[PDB]
């Protein structure tokens, strides 16, 4: 019944700077008899299994560097990474083992903060091969941009679309720390042949004004 | 060194049974807790249960109301997690973990991915994302396949720089879709050839799709 809450969900930190992750328990996890908080922290790196970092709220596991520290008591705890390194990019989870069932926080993804980089926008029409199948996929690509926040909107003959597009985002690039995003608009071949102009509108904080890529069918 | 070897990924349909396993080594298996944690993308991990193999003492999360059973074979130093009737909600990655008396999980396995879906095996259709100033972009749309994964390369691995292959997305139809793009000099669109190599082993599908301007 103990709910574990973490904040923020994603945290961008510059290299060599401090990362501070917060965790809250809906009930205290402190026992007066032993003066210990029943709180653990885990680190899950990209494509790997979680790794126990801390228990008793502040006791590090063997091998964990001193720059990673846990603190707090009762219901409020924090994890701190004092000089962030590229290897510290991961999702961090807290966990209470004061009462059963054991419960985890929602996680906090720590990522590398860098300067703003505007997306390059490309639009791709459906292939003739696919049109033979009865469906048309229109793709919009936002390439190498930072930060992740971006607004992607589809317009067909100036008519805003909704409910018929899906987005996919890459993980942070290892060399330049940017993201890329795909937006896929799926239409029936009929609806696609009914309309002429297909436009992808991208809003991003690195752009002076929204950018529109379009094409005319045929 | 403590080792926790889990069994490989599983694709199953709703209503079927499944038993995944985790063999522990490098420690006294019978006298230490071993259990399971579940992970679905939209929330934090969920604890499922622990078992003390020495005496079969099993502790379940009440939320999992008899859906799963945990067991262990001391001779094989192996822990098990079994569903008698799988549901779609059981699609997740299952980590096997160890614990002392307090309940923090000090050793974790590599994980076992479990997919539950009524969908049937299907190979992808591969469609070009044909390019149209300085930099051009082109790609391959890999659509309507099941199960994961597909693998995409470009020019048989010779082209790596500027390649972005997006995570697969599950469509409403139950089949996965993804795109692999790459950015290239606009001046190279007429001179060099770009081919994406798509491989979907579950259906033994192999496609080498050439992408060119249109």
């Amino acid at each position: 019944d103990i709910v574990m809450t973490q904040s923020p969900d994603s945290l961008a930190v510059s290299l060599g700077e401090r990362a501070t992750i917060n965790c809250k328990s809906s009930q205290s996890v402190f026992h007066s008899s032993n003066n210990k908080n029943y709180l653990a922290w885990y680190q899950q790196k990209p494509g790997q299994s979680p790794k126990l970092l801390i228990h008793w709220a502040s006791a590090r596991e063997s091998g964990v560097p001193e720059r990673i520290s846990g603190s707090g008591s009762g219901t409020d705890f924090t994890l701190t990474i004092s000089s962030l390194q590229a290897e510290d990019v991961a999702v961090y989870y807290c966990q209470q083992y004061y009462s059963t069932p054991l419960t985890f926080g929602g996680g906090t993804k720590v990522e590398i903060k860098r300067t703003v980089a505007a997306p390059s926008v490309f639009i791709f029409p459906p292939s003739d091969e696919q049109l033979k199948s009865g469906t048309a996929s229109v793709v919009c690509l936002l390439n190498n941009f930072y930060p992740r926040e971006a607004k992607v909107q589809w317009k067909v003959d100036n008519a805003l679309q909704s409910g018929n597009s899906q987005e996919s985002v890459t993980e942070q690039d290892s060399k330049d720390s940017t993201y890329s995003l795909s937006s896929t608009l799926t239409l029936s071949k009929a609806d696609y042949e009914k309309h002429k102009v297909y436009a992808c509108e991208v809003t991003h904080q690195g752009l002076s004004s929204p950018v529109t890529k379009s094409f005319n069918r045929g | 060194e403590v080792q926790l070897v889990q069994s490989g990924a599983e694709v199953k349909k709703p209503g079927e049974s499944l038993r995944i396993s985790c063999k522990g080594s490098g420690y006294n298996f019978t006298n230490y807790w071993i259990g399971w944690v579940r992970q679905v993308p939209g929330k934090g991990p969920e604890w499922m249960g622990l078992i003390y193999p020495s005496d079969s003492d099993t502790r379940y999360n009440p939320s999992l109301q008899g859906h799963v059973t945990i067991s262990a074979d001391k001779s094989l130093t192996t822990a098990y997690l079994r569903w008698s009737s799988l549901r779609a909600s059981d699609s997740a990655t299952y980590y096997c973990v160890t614990s002392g008396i307090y309940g923090y999980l000090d050793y974790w396995g590599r994980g076992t991915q479990v997919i539950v879906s009524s969908a049937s095996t299907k190979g992808p259709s591969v469609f070009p994302l044909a390019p149209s100033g300085g930099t051009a972009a082109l790609g391959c749309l890999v659509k309507d396949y099941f199960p994961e994964p597909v693998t995409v390369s470009w020019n048989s691995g010779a082209l790596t720089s500027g390649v972005h292959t997006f995570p697969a997305v599950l469509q409403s139809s139950g089949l996965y879709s993804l795109s692999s793009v790459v950015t290239v000099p606009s001046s190279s669109l007429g001179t060099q050839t770009y081919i994406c190599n798509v491989n979907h082993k579950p259906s033994n599908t192999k496609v080498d799709k050439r992408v060119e301007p249109k």
Binding site: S33, N34, S99 | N28, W33, R59, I101, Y102, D106
Partner: peptide
């Protein structure tokens, strides 16, 4: 006064 959810007399701490 030991408070441990999974206490066991015979546990081998790794």
């Amino acid at each position: 006064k030991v408070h441990a959810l999974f206490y066991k007399l015979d546990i081998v701490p790794i």
